[PDB]
Structures are given as structure tokens and as C-alpha cells.
């Protein structure tokens, strides 16, 4: 029968016009049951309806419709592990949001996707139910009720087929852990698939670096306990033999640079095949071709493995592709940071030839800024251009503000409270401002730094620093005196190699020495300063205003910041008071720490450390005793009490500020002193020379899984602090404190590891050469921040 009008009872979201036109029918056409069914099927195929009931009341097709209800609210119950935010984001991934229609067909897929997310997280018992509560006006409240369950953790990572290396040794380098000791910080036993793949590639690297060019990971089984609480990772490998690298033969499109590449692909006579070295020379060929203007110099090293001689011939197919030029480098997401802050980290120049190495260097430099959670790159191709690209750096800004509160404890500083508030990207300008503070047993420090990391485009940083320092010497195991200092330092740090960094600065420091214990060395310095106090009146006072030119040179070629195994860190830091200061003196310091690995795995290292220092007045004056050098404690000479090494305080007879018999009150007259007296308390020296041969060895009685997480070492520390200005002629009864020959020595064991409480550094050192007065504490330790 003919159809004239189509009613749409039940429509409240799809416009009657839209619903009508979505049906492939126009008014005035002949409709039979076949056409009715076809219209129903198409109208429901529009994906807006959950019930179509076309009625024939009278001569009009009353298209009764049940509409796809709108999601009134998305709620979550039982998702304790995961906050609602990422749940809602993963819902948006499926287009499910408050105000969107609930199709009732994808919710099963959505809860299945949530369960898949949980299974990735490791909660393999996780359950998700999408309950729908009807609400008036055709609405549904979607309650995603979760039963996360226990997160499965790796009970065992097993390698089958490893005979050249123990399973523990191989697994130690995996970011998936089957054992996480409480005392150590090795990681978590949680399992992620991407971590499993990264660990398989770590195993590949481990074996290909030792010459196992035929190494192959036959399979990787991941098993669950029936309770789905434990995960077992079995890596079935077939490590071949150790293959030698006979030679590297290069071919392809070398762009006329075959000579330089050939000099790059030079190997020792039949060395041991090393996948790391092969990739290193591939990257060196990439760098060479990039320095020749090639943006994407592809270099594929295929090893032709001859099992007969067990050798490898590296066919390095090199295709130095086209030259692409960066029309412009864009930054997306630098809403806080100004453009120059991101752009001055670009090693790739805009308006230059593209180098993938340079673009990745810029990306990693942007990551190193710390201003961004993510820094992706996109070398988009300029429209209608064969060789022009835009390098878009899509960053996502972080909260560069950070307040830290650390607590450490050590035999040196006692309880060390550190606090701080830092803005590393002040107003997105790249200025790192921040107020820090420290509180040891003996020194309360409070700093306010403001460093422009790029005072010059070249990277020369300029940093001001307002410091305050209340140093109670007696708490530092020195002779009693309280130096309350404060002042400024404006320092230009000049980078010169990315390993060497100079820094020249001008500083002001006002020092107020109070409660100075009457002693020979302090009063020598004070007499040199034109003040003539009395050896009585322990409550002395002395204020100085010193303008210093500080200089510094930090060479830092340590491959690892934590537990270095190779390289050297030298730090020559000096300080010369400029004319116009109250104190006239220079003070040079030279730290050194050379790690020489004596094996292949870098497990056996020799740390040759040294700590030199020399200070002295510039004529008539004398270096302030409070700038003296100290030795002892678990920083210079272990097994010696902090600062004990060196000249000891020669005290004068005086009345004690506090008098209480049976104390000796630092040898006071009121206690029964009448002449100059020696003492066991150190004053430091204007000269200092400390050294330490520390044989770092693998930690013996500990699983290879995390034996590299603990640094064991056996150290021999030399150290002599001396007062070059000591009046040997005038003080003949007392020990000659101007003697560098008084080389204190200690030998001991040291154990470092990154415990949950912080970097723990214990050491037991016996001082086998200590002079009179040198207080020795054998067990040093530091629970650092």
C-alpha cells in the first residue's frame, strides 16, 4: 500500500528530518513489507537506534523507535589502583563520554579493553563490568565496576641454553626483575610486555657483544601460576660460538667518502665480534655522512658468518641518501617555555642541511632540560618540495617547580636535613631559581640561586647565589668557633667540551667569627689581620668582608654518574681574594677521581682519587683558619674521624665561657690550665694532600642478579693536612704541624648501594698510620640524600 506520512514516535536525539532522510524512502512511494524491512535495516544501520518498531496504524507507517540512550554519567567503582582520569581517557579512545550515546554493543569491547589494560599492568585477575542504570528521558548511567585483584609479579626469569654466562649474570641487566631485595633498589617485579621485549633485546646485546654472532633467542615463554599471582619468563636461547670479526667490507652509495668510511671500518686483527662496536661504527658512518650533508645516511651491517673458521665478515651496505634542508624548526607545546629556551638546545640549525643525528641530539637535549614530560620529533616534508623539511619538536611541558625535603645521616654530618624549592624554568625563561637549605651537625646553609643557563647563546651560564652559612666548628670535630657567613656569588660557567667546564665568578662573603677558642693558629691568623685580641675571653669576635675571584675547571668524563667504572672527574676550584677585601689569600683545590677499569665487564675498577689543596695569604696576611683544609671521615681518609687529620689546636690558658670541673673545657685556665697545651681536636691546615687507591671489586656474597647494584671496594687512603705557617722555631715542644711528611694512612672496605633510604655508603677502615691526636673512627657510614 502507498505510504504518505512517516511518524517517528520516540525520537529525541536524531532530528525528524535526519531520521526520515536516513531511511532510503521518499513520501509518495509504494511500500510493501520488503520495503518496510529494508527501511528498518538501514535506519538501524545508521547506528543511532536500539529498537525500531514500524507500526501500520491507519495508512501511515508509525515508526516507533527506541533511541540509543545518552551516557548521563560515567562512574567507576573498585578502580583503586588506577585513578578515574586514565579510565576516562581510555573511554574517550572508544568515544564513550558523558553526553554521548551508549550503543550497548561497544561497552563489552570497552570493558574488555579495560581488562586488557589491567592485564598489561599485570592484574591478570582484573574484572570489569559495565552496568547501565536507566534514567528518565532515555538516559543511562554507565558504572564501570572493577575488581582489579592482585597484580602479578615476576617470580622467576629463566634463560635456557645459556652456558657461557650464568642466568643471574644475564638477568642482572634486565629491567624485569624476579628478585627485588628490600635493602637494595633494583626495580619492581611487575611485568610489562614492552619491558620483556626490551630485556630480550638486552640479552641479544649482551651475547652479540661477546662474539656470539650466531646467538638466537629460540623462544620466550611467559607463564602464570594458576592463581595468576606469579609470572615466569623463560627465554630459550641458543648461544652459538664466539665468532671473530675477520674484517669489514663496505659497499653502496658512499658519495665519494669511501676513504673516510674505510678508515672508520678498521678493526684489530681477528678481534672478537661485538655487536656494540658494529653499531658504533655504523653510527660513526652515519655521523660522517651527516657531516657531509646527508640527512638519512642508511647503514645496514649484515654479518656473513663463516662457522668453519668461526669468523664474521661485516658487509656494511651504506646508502648515503639525499640531502634534506630544514626550512624551519618548529616547537609545539612550549606554552610556558619561550621559543629560545627550546631552540638554543637545537644542535640542528634551521636553514641548514638536515642531519638526523643533529635532530636527535636536539631532542635529547630538550629531554635533558627537564622542562618536558615528553619530547617527540616530526621531520615533516615541506609541501611540493623534494629536499626541504620542517623539524617539529612536539614537547609537553612539565611542572618545572619542585620542592625537595631530604634526610640523611652520616658519621660526618650527623643528621643532615636538606630542604629546597626550585623553579628550573622560571617563567619559561630557562632561568633556574631556587632557595635551598642544609642543616648538618655543624653547618646550617641557606642558598638562593638564580642561574641563567644561557647568558651567552653559546651556553655560557651566569648564576647569582645568595648564601648564608652558620658553621659551628666544635660540632665539626674542630676547635670551637662559630663562623656565621653570608654573601653573594655571581659565576660565569663557560662550557668548552661537554666534559670540561670552566667557571669564573666574583663573590662576596662577610664572615663573623664568634666564640673563637683561644688557640695558636687562630690567633696567628688574627695577628696577621691586624687585630690583637687577648688569649682569654673565649667569647671573641671578628668580622671580615672578603671579595673573591673564584675560578674553577671541572673535567668530567665519567661514563656513569652512579658507580662510575671508567673515566675521570677532576675539579680544580680556586679562590683568590681581590684587593679591597679584609682577608688577602688564595686557596686552590683539586679534586680528582680516575676510574680505570681493569677488565671487560667493568666489574673490576681502580679508583685513583686525590684531593689536593693549598692556601696562603698574599703577603703579610694569612689564609683564614675557617677556610682551612681538613682530612678524615668518609670523604678524604676513611677510618679517621671527620677533620681529625692535620694540625691540632694548640690552646692558650683561658677562662671557660662555661665552667664545670671534670670536663677540661678545651684546656681552660679555670679548669686548671696555666701554660700552652696540646689538644686532640683538629684545626685544619692551609695545605692538604689526600689520595686513595680504591680497588672496586664485584660484591662477593650476593646474587649476580643485583651484585652490580652494590659497589664493593677495598681502599687505601693517604692523607696529610699541614699548616705551612706553623711557627716551628717558636713552637719547638709541640709537633711540627708544617710537616707534609705526616702522611696518615688507612686501609679498609667500602660498600655503596642505592638503598630505599638513599645512597648508603658504609666503610670500615683501620688507620694503620695515624699520628698523635688523630682521632680514628673505623666505621664510617653515610645515609645520603
Amino acid at each position: 500500500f502507498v505510504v504518505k506520512d512517516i511518524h517517528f514516535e520516540g525520537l529525541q536525539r536524531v532530528a525528524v528530518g535526519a531520521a526520515l532522510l536516513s531511511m532510503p524512502v521518499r513520501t509518495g512511494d509504494t511500500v510493501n513489507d520488503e520495503d518496510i524491512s529494508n527501511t528498518i535495516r538501514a535506519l538501524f544501520a545508521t547506528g543511532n537506534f536500539e529498537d525500531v518498531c514500524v507500526l501500520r496504524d491507519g495508512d501511515t507507517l508509525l515508526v516507533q523507535v527506541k533511541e540509543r540512550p545518552t551516557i548521563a554519567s560515567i562512574t567507576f567503582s573498585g578502580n583503586k589502583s588506577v585513578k578515574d582520569d586514565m579510565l576516562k581517557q581510555n573511554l574517550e579512545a572508544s568515544g564513550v563520554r558523558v553526553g554521548e550515546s551508549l550503543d550497548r554493543t561497544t561497552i563489552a569491547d570497552i570493558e574488555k579493553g579495560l581488562e586488557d589494560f589491567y592485564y598489561s599492568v599485570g592484574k591478570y585477575s582484573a574484572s570489569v563490568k559495565a552496568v547501565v542504570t536507566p534514567l528518565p528521558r532515555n538516559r543511562v548511567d554507565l558504572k564501570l565496576v572493577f575488581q582489579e585483584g592482585v597484580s602479578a609479579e615476576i617470580q622467576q626469569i629463566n634463560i635456557v641454553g645459556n652456558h657461557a654466562f650464568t642466568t643471574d649474570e644475564l638477568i642482572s641487566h634486565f629491567q624485569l626483575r624476579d628478585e627485588v631485595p628490600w635493602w637494595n633498589v633494583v626495580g619492581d617485579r611487575k611485568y610489562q610486555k614492552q619491558k620483556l621485549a626490551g630485556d630480550l633485546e638486552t640479552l641479544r646485546s649482551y651475547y652479540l657483544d661477546r662474539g656470539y654472532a650466531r646467538f638466537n633467542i629460540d623462544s620466550t615463554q611467559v607463564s602464570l601460576t594458576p592463581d595468576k599471582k606469579g609470572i615466569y619468563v623463560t627465554v630459550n636461547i641458543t648461544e652459538g660460538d664466539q665468532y671473530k670479526l675477520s674484517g669489514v667490507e663496505v659497499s653502496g652509495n658512499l658519495a665519494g667518502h669511501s676513504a673516510e668510511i674505510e678508515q672508520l671500518t678498521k678493526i684489530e686483527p681477528g678481534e672478537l665480534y661485538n655487536g656494540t662496536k658494529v653499531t658504533k661504527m655504523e653510527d660513526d658512518i652515519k655521523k660522517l655522512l651527516g657531516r657531509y650533508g646527508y640527512a638519512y645516511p642508511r647503514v645496514q651491517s649484515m654479518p656473513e658468518i663463516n662457522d668453519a673458521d668461526k669468523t664474521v665478515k661485516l658487509r656494511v651496505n651504506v646508502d648515503a641518501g639525499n640531502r634534506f634542508y630544514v626550512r624551519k624548526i618548529r616547537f609545539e607545546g612550549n606554552d610556558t617555555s619561550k621559543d629560545a629556551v627550546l631552540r638554543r638546545e637545537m644542535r640542528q640549525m634551521e636553514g641548514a642541511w638536515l642531519g638526523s643525528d643533529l635532530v636527535d641530539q636536539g631532542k635529547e637535549r630538550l629531554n635533558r632540560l627537564g622542562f618536558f614530560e615528553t619530547v617527540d620529533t616530526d621531520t615533516q616534508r615541506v609541501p611540493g618540495s623534494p629536499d626541504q623539511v620542517d623539524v617539529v619538536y612536539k614537547v609537553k611541558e612539565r611542572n618545572t617547580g619542585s620542592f625537595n625535603f631530604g634526610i640523611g645521616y652520616g658519621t660526618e654530618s650527623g643528621v643532615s636535613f636538606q630542604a629546597g624549592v626550585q623553579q628550573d624554568n622560571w617563567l619559561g625563561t630557562g632561568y633556574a631559581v631556587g632557595i635551598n637549605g642544609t642543616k648538618n651537625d655543624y653547618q646550617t646553609y641557606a642558598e638562593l640561586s638564580v642561574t641563567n643557563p644561557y647568558f651567552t647563546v653559546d651556553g655560557v651560564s651566569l648564576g647569582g647565589r645568595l648564601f648564608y652559612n652558620d658553621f659551628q666548628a666544635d660540632d665539626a670535630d674542630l676547635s670551637d668557633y662559630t663562623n656565621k657567613s653570608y654573601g653573594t656569588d655571581v659565576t660565569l660557567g663557560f662550557p668548552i667540551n661537554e666534559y670540561n667546564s670552566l667557571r669564573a665568578g666574583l663573590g662576596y662573603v662577610h664572615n663573623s667569627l664568634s666564640n673563637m677558642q683561644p688557640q695558636v693558629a687562630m690567633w696567628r691568623y688574627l695577628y696577621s689581620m691586624g687585630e690583637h685580641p687577648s688569649t682569654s675571653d673565649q667569647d671573641n669576635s671578628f668580622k671580615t668582608d672578603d671579595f673573591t675571584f673564584n675560578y674553577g675547571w671541572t673535567y668530567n668524563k665519567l661514563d656513569r654518574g652512579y658507580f662510575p667504572t671508567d673515566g675521570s672527574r677532576v675539579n680544580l676550584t680556586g679562590k683568590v681574594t681581590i684587593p679591597g677585601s679584609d682577608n688577602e689569600y688564595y686557596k686552590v683545590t683539586l679534586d680528582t677521581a680516575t676510574y680505570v677499569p681493569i677488565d671487560d665487564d667493568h666489574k673490576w675498577v681502580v679508583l685513583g682519587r686525590t684531593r689536593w689543596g693549598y692556601g696562603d695569604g698574599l703577603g703579610g696576611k694569612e689564609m683564614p683558619f675557617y677556610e682551612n683544609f681538613y682530612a678524615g671521615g668518609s670523604s678524604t681518609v676513611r677510618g679517621f674521624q671527620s677533620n681529625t687529620i692535620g694540625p691540632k689546636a694548640v690552646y692558650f690558658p683561658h677562662q671557660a665561657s662555661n665552667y664545670d670541673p671534670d670536663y677540661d673545657y678545651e684546656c681552660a685556665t679555670q679548669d686548671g690550665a696555666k701554660d700552652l697545651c696540646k689538644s686532640d681536636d683538629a684545626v685544619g691546615g692551609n695545605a692538604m694532600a689526600v689520595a686513595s687507591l680504591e680497588f672496586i671489586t664485584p660484591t662477593p656474597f650476593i646474587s649476580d642478579k643485583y651484585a652490580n647494584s652494590v659497589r664493593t671496594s677495598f681502599f687505601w687512603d693517604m692523607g696529610t693536612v699541614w699548616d705551612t705557617n706553623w711557627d716551628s722555631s717558636q713552637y719547638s715542644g709541640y709537633p711540627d704541624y708544617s710537616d707534609p711528611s705526616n702522611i696518615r694512612m688507612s686501609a679498609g672496605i667500602a660498600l655503596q648501594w642505592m638503598s630505599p633510604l638513599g645512597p648508603l655508603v658504609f666503610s670500615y677502615a683501620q688507620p694503620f698510620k695515624k699520628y698523635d691526636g688523630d682521632k680514628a673512627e673505623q666505621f664510617q657510614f653515610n645515609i645520603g640524600k
Partner: peptide, 7 residues
């Protein structure tokens, strides 16, 4: 121990 919280 050092605890760092980013504001």
C-alpha cells in the same frame, strides 16, 4: 632519603 615533589 630525598624527596622530591614537583609543583
Amino acid at each position: 632519603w630525598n624527596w622530591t615533589k614537583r609543583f
